């Protein structure tokens with residue numbers, strides 16, 4: 089009749105084999121290997137690095153959850169769900185579940201949540217020896233993979249941010265923590281007379297240059313490698329913070345906003361774009377954001393924030409909330425000017 | 429399926445924050461703390477060992493999943509779900525989720541699942557320094573907590589074992605690997621005429637002696653400390669194996685069946701009570717059993733087995749599979765006898 093069984097509900101929540109069965113199978117590329125059709129375990133185990141027995145058993149669980157079909161014993165075919173796990177797929181989940189990549193690799197922190205509760209700080213260092221940014225920097229290939237994954241998210245959100253802000257009284261925009269520059273590229277091409285500056289890590293900006301630095305919009309952008317905890321390049325009236333504040337704890341997220349305020353001068357405008365948490369939660373939107381927030385606590389030192397917490401940071405960095413809007417999709421867009 | 433529906437369902441499957449939030453919060457005793465009613469985070473944080481902000485954010489994820497209530501910001505209260513996580517509770521799930529206890533401790537092995545596909549064998553040693561049995565033996569407190577947690581699963585299935593078998597042909601049963609012996613005890617007083625023996629480790633059985641060795645059932649039961657891989661005690665005409673084979677890789681599980689086949693002699697019984705995996709997809713619990721099988725692979729060297737995986741193992745010990753009937757509660761029961769006859 090209805091969904092009233094508290095015991096069953098608890099069984100849904102406590103499963104930890106399924107999420108790591110899932111991640112592992114994506115890492116070993118089984119969605120790709122079965123995309124064509126039914127494949128028996130001997131074959132799937134050979135191509136990936138796997139023991140046939142173990143893989144049979146891991147796929148059996150995931151087949152009980154509808155990720156794979158098993159029409160006979162030890163043969164596994166594709167489903168609507170496995171389509172979404174393929175590299176092939178337009179909006180693929182692969183970069184977020186692949187343990188080769190840095191994003192899913194950070195989910196190994198889940199086992200250290202107790203220490204995270206004791207110290208109130210991140211546990212990426214406890215899992216891997218160094219905290220997230222340090223070891224993404226010491227392993228460039230991991231850093232490149234991080235940047236490529238983030239570029240997939242940015243690419244979806246770009247056209248919306250470009251439209252979502254007013255660019256009339258803006259002559260030079262700085263994308264601070266802008267990744268490969270997917271958002272800035274859109275802003276500039278949408279507004280032919282804008283100057284741009286991509287500020288990020290050196291190999292990140294350089295990979296961004298290769299991608300679109302030759303294009304019409306690329307010509308009107310300086311690709312400036314560096315750190316946004318230091319002083320920023322001068323002469324930007326607008327600074328753009330698209331999904332960077334939630335990576336950082338309160339003192340560090342503050343320091344970024346200070347450097348952005350410093351960079352834009354008085355009556356300069358710092359433009360923030362995040363998904364913000366909302367007190368009286370809701371269904372799938374708020375639950376997903378609360379999950380993501382624990383990823384921020386464990387991997388990074390960060391946090392998803394409400395509008396009012398964002399306001400407490402802006403006030404301590406000589407800024408004030410001007411115009412809060414929202415993209416027809418849920419991404420909120422806040423413009424901040426200077427005080428006095 | 430179609431894209432968005434598939435997408436929704438995948439999000440449920442991929443979530444690793446929730447199940448560790450849940451285990452963290454159970455380890456800290458937050459369900460006990462809110463049993464009386466709403467508590468502020470300040471008090472929860474103070475009474476757990478926790479930073480308030482860290483705990484708050486953990487609790488609001490679990491709030492959106494229905495484990496706790498949050499009626500105003502930063503206050504958390506009990507639910508039907510949290511009631512089941514109290515130590516207090518009769519059907520309590522705390523021992524399966526408390527990371528200070530041995531069961532949930534094993535769940536940390538999930539992060540090394542790729543290594544387990546690489547080699548095939550367990551990764552408890554990779555995670556903790558020793559394989560599951562050896563650091564359970566090296567930490568007496570975990571050893572008792574394991575036996576207390578296994579006795580709770582024994583408690584809910586012992587009635588079904590007694591009525592599920594025919595004890596008429598039996599004189600002296602021996603519950604091999606039987607734990608504290610909740611399955612033997614319910615067997616010995618539901619059948620007054622029988623004798624008993626409980627083989628497990630010495631502190632496991634001496635604790636079982638303290639629990640019910642004084643009772644009327646316990647007077648007829650020899651509480652023997654030992655190892656079921658070595659020669660079993662002499663003079664039983666049946667051996668009982670209640671959820672003991674799924675802990676062991678084929679080769680160790682074989683050795684256990686041989687000692688059971690040897691101990692009873694010809695015209696004896698080896699009675700096996702296990703949850704068996706089905707080739708199709710059962711329902712429900714094939715999902716749950718496939719979940720458990722992955723724990724058995726990662727933590728222990730073990731496996732959930734089909735009837736025929738059992739048949740092969742009993743076969744190689746000179747046993748055949750006789751009667752195969754199933755409990756209402758879903759447990760398969762099989763009487764094994766000597767392979768070759770008359």
Ligand SMILES: C[S@@+](CC[C@H](N)C(=O)[O-])C[C@H]1O[C@@H](n2cnc3c(N)ncnc32)[C@H](O)[C@@H]1O
Pocket residue numbers: 221235238239241242265266267268269270271287288289292314315316317329330331332335
């Ligand atoms: C969430 S990401 C990318 C956000 C970007 N708007 C996007 O969606 O592609 C945050 C960015 O901050 C950058 N970052 C981290 N620490 C930094 C530092 N000290 N200086 C400059 N950039 C940094 C990362 O390299 C990354 O590109």
Ligand SMILES: C[S@@+](CC[C@H](N)C(=O)[O-])C[C@H]1O[C@@H](n2cnc3c(N)ncnc32)[C@H](O)[C@@H]1O
Pocket residue numbers: 561578579581582604605606607611627628629632654655656657670671672675
């Ligand atoms: C799954 S449990 C037993 C379940 C229990 N009979 C019940 O019905 O709840 C596994 C048993 O194997 C036992 N065990 C582990 N190593 C052993 C050894 N060397 N000798 C005897 N028993 C051992 C454990 O103490 C534990 O009681």
